[PDB]
Amino acid sequence: LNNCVFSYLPSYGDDEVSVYHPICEAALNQALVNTGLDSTYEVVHHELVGSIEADFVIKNKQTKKYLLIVEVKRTKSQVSSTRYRLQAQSYVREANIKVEQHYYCLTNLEIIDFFKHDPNKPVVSQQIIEPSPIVVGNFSDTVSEFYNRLVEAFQNIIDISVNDAGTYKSSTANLVDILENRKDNSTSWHQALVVAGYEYIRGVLRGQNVEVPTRDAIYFKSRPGRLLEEGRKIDFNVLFSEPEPNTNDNDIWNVNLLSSLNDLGRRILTGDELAELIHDIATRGRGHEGVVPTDIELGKVLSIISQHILGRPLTEDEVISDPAAGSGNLLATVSAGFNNVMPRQIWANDIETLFLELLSIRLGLLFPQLVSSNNAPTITGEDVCSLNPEDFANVSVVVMNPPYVSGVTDPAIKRKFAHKIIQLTGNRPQTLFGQIGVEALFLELVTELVQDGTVISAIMPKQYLTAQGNESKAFREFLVGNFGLEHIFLYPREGLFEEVIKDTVVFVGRKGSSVEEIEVLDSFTPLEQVDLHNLKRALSNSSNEQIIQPMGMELRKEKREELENRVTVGWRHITSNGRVAEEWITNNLESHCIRLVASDYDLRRGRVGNKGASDLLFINSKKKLWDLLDESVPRDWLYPALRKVNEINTPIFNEDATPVRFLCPPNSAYQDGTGESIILDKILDVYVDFQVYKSKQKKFEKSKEELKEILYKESDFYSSEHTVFIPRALRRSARAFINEQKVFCSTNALEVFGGNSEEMWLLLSWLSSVFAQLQFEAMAKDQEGERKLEKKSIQNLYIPNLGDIDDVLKQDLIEEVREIHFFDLCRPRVRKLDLLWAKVFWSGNEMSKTKEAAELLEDLVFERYPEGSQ
Ligand SMILES: Nc1ncnc2c1ncn2[C@@H]1O[C@H](CSCC[C@H](N)C(=O)O)[C@@H](O)[C@H]1O
Ligand SMILES: [Mn+2]
Missing domain, CATH: 3.40.50.12420 (Rossmann fold)
Incomplete structure (x- = not known):
């Protein structure tokens, strides 16, 4: 009989979700019951469709495909609007292969407009389907007459969609x-x-x-x-x-x-x-x-x-x-x-x-x-x-x-x-x-x-x-x-x-x-x-x-x-934006985490290349010097190196990640008589001659004896296996990386060490997530341009309790690191890695809390660094 449980129709000024949606939802459901299509189809409120959320979908129970998308607006002028018609159409374009029929709907309950998306004819007004616009009534009408007419209109629309019987106006x-x-x-x-x-x-x-x-x-x-x-x-x-x-x-x-x-x-x-x-x-x-x-x-x-x-x-x-x-x-x-x-x-x-x-x-x-x-x-x-x-x-x-x-x-x-x-x-x-x-x-x-x-x-x-x-x-x-x-x-x-x-x-x-x-x-x-x-x-x-x-x-x-x-x-x-993010982190992450400074891990600024002679330590960073020296240096004297934090661009920090190399002669290159000391003498000679060539007065005073000592010293600042590295300054990329073999790192990055292989890969997986990055942007709430964070601020990052992730998931988390690059901070996207990590913090709801972090991050990044979005 279409028994209405509502005492009032909305006012234009009423909260859409609280006031309009329950009326629309009851009506869609009743329409399915009246036609007996409720055995096949369900009404879903707030259906996630790709990166967007639809007000209502009529969804096939067995196939999970979409019969009809319904978008709700408050005013008649909104229903007439091309912008909102494109927004409703967008759900069909975003659903694509998940679609049963290409029908969509825009409504403030008073008026229903009914459309069929056709990719070969995308102009909204070419897509209006008979008999749109359906006048259900006006909000000053008696509730029960209005509600009945709403139900009957939805029935009509659903019947037409399910049979693909629509005709363009x-x-x-x-x-x-x-x-x-x-x-x-x-x-x-x-x-x-x-x-x-x-x-x-x-x-x-x-x-x-x-x-x-x-x-x-x-x-x-x-x-x-x-x-x-x-x-x-x-x-x-x-x-x-x-x-x-x-x-x-x-x-x-x-x-x-x-x-x-x-x-x-x-x-x-x-x-x-x-x-x-x-x-x-x-x-x-x-x-x-x-x-x-x-x-x-x-x-x-x-x-x-x-x-x-x-x-x-x-x-x-x-x-x-x-x-x-x-x-x-x-x-x-x-x-x-x-x-x-x-x-x-x-x-x-x-x-x-x-x-x-x-x-x-x-x-x-x-x-x-x-x-x-x-x-x-x-x-x-x-x-x-x-x-x-x-x-x-x-x-x-x-x-x-x-x-x-x-x-x-x-x-x-x-x-x-x-x-x-x-x-x-x-x-x-x-x-x-x-x-x-x-x-x-x-x-x-x-x-x-x-x-x-x-x-x-x-x-x-x-x-x-x-x-x-x-x-x-x-x-x-x-x-x-x-x-x-x-x-x-x-x-x-x-x-x-x-x-x-x-x-x-x-x-x-x-x-x-x-x-x-x-x-x-x-x-x-x-x-x-x-x-x-x-x-x-x-x-x-x-x-x-x-x-x-x-x-x-x-x-x-x-x-x-x-x-x-x-x-x-x-x-x-x-x-x-920064305050709400600080709140969100506290109400969602802090209970399951510890602060990096409380943990067992050590933090240290990159040591290499702080006391001059950078051009020698990073032998291949400068092209003209390298055009001279490349034929003179044994390949196995070259170790993968970090000078500018920019040059890595992958979570795996090894020879394949970067062409940049640090010059580390073996111990025998420093003792006299060997062939190794010979190889090195030749190298340093050519290095001295190039410094002359570059000098306006054709002078270079520093001896090979001294250059030897600098190289020997800096060699000791190598980074152990499974160090995780945090750039001190970023613009746009979410950068953090790990090494498998001996590497050398400049003062431009922070080193995290102390854990074992698994503990360290997990930490990298964390740093690569929207959740850690969200925390960084929060610490940087009062910055413009690049995000510059030092030991002082990063000490305080919250890292997940080791004894809180199940061993299967731990294996899924590390694995996932192997198949990402650095996500774009200006345009974060929810991905398997984030959803994976979400299992650690929430039973309800993985997607929606991960989707929130992503949105908060995007907004904070837009404040600090707009140009990444243009
Ligand atoms: N130099 C100018 N002098 C006066 N109006 C201008 C202008 N240059 C652009 N406009 C108008 O500025 C408008 C952008 S505002 C877009 C209007 C929107 N539909 C609304 O409801 O508000 C365009 O319609 C454009 O024609
Ligand atoms: Mn809506």
Whole structure:
């Protein structure tokens, strides 16, 4: 009977996992029972698929293959969004051979969109399957009717998937086609959007009991000028402008397509569907791109933060602006969070004129009860460098996801922004130093353009927080200057093939202010899990003394003086990433480990080559000397050596690991009469002559007698079998190695010794894991550039209790070392070695705790050394 156990339907602001997921899960299960497919298929919540986690999969019990992937979102605008449709599609691409059928689904429960991934036709809107979009209802509906309809829709979708009976929606496809062919013709592009938009707008508005002109577009086919006038009576001036459609248009006067668009409007009741569809096609000369991909969850949080920095109500004359509006998603989301805004207070601008219509459509239908011929958003298609302070006079809040170009700045773009800033301020840009990015110039230009007190919220690459180039230094100077930084928001973002990523940040300023303490807001939780009601109240209750933390987040305060004085070095000190990692290590690793210093092992800095004559000790390190000497040195006098920690690149430190050699003559080479002493005399002779050759005065004083003694001494600093070596300085590779035979090590590495073969290989296996590396990055929480750790800090590393690993596993752990290289710290990946080690610490859950360490490591490394991720 579909008996519902739920008392309420969600609110858009409810935590997705806590509130939406149980409803969706109960419905999927019921759908399997109703059709009797529960004998064959199971519902799995949070299914790990490669490096990502799916909200729901319908999974075959016997084969473990995927019938259907279901991704849940909170809002209708999210379901319409190409970004989130690509995220859902990604699960099918990541599952590949584990797939039964290529069907996937995106839903906020109110609306279900149903798709079939086809690798030979990857464009999302080409993949919508009939009868999407399925309108289940609205969250203000009676729960039981709504729940029943949810169950029936899932039943339909499951039946179609299991039989591979899906059919691609043709109208969507026909409209995509029409627009793709008009992309390079602004006249016909616009003409198509006039007709299509008229029909879609009328559907959205009629479904919401808003009065619309009663005649359908096709009625005006012979008099299209009338279509323009009929549209203007609703609003959307920039859409309902010239040029008129042509009567002779071979594509747009199609009853089927036009009805379909009107119906689509009736179904969605939002401007989002059509706007996203247009944006996909228009944004094909990409880019067009900005700092982050579409993030509606972020936009919702930004809205709350903006209002809190504003610190007062927005009056009726005050405007909310996005000067590089793009798709309109961010402006639409942020605007919607201001109760009582009028359509006339929203201003969207973008240089790309192909976005004009879609911006009109999205933002005009945003407030469907209010939009009219006298009350509509302003939509402009101007380069920011053409705008003037007067254009921003009424602007009280700016939000932006500024243009970003992942590569090398176009100098003509650079110049165009710089001149405009010079013109406005009389001075060069505060940000234009080093290898400038357009995003910083854009932000600075907008800042100069607005009035004091204007709230400016900008999404920026996180590198700006922590990087040490002159461009990041100048940027932080800008932030605590004119920009009037008040708030820093740190959050995790979602990627196509990566669950969480901390590579972006939000900077919120109030122009011309100089607040004493700057807010730092850190979300430990993905933004979909943030209860928006809790956050609203946490920010506005946080008085002077008592700082109230929102759930899954920490709010802290930093003194401006501290950021001002730490502008060259960076603001890494403000992030919590190092603290949580220290906590994670303590709650998960410490009980089963001991500190290296407590253990039986000895620690010692590499001894070789500390007291000069490096070029002789490492006979083959210098090419010109070696071109001379190579024919003169017996191969068995050469021992594998470490000078620069860089030259090894493998866990096994032997002759095959490195070409670098140390010169160790045998004992008989030092006594007189033998042939060995002869061989050595020859060598030293040629060495002396080359030192002359290199000398400007053709002089070298030091005798063979002395060189003999140095070589004899340094020979005694060899490293015993099964030493494990720790580089003192690393950039990007997780480096640790072991030797099997006698080697020589420079001062550039730390030596660990004392154990036996097995104890030593196990320690190497540990050092090669994400867990040991995590600990290193934690000790280095206050560093930039290379990670430099000496005996002092490494003494304190936690190493696993020897008597805690089972003998089979010990054998698996050592073995695994034999089949790895050095993992990339900027992009760690969970692998057998880590999972193996995970068995020592956890029964629940190996994968998920190993996946956490990996993510924490990645985030810490991104702070210390960004460039490895670009
Ligand atoms: N020089 C310039 N002046 C004004 N706007 C610009 C610009 N260069 C790029 N832009 C715009 O900056 C935008 C990046 S932001 C991407 C917008 C995103 N869809 C959203 O909802 O926020 C692009 O749309 C691009 O057209
Ligand atoms: Mn979800």
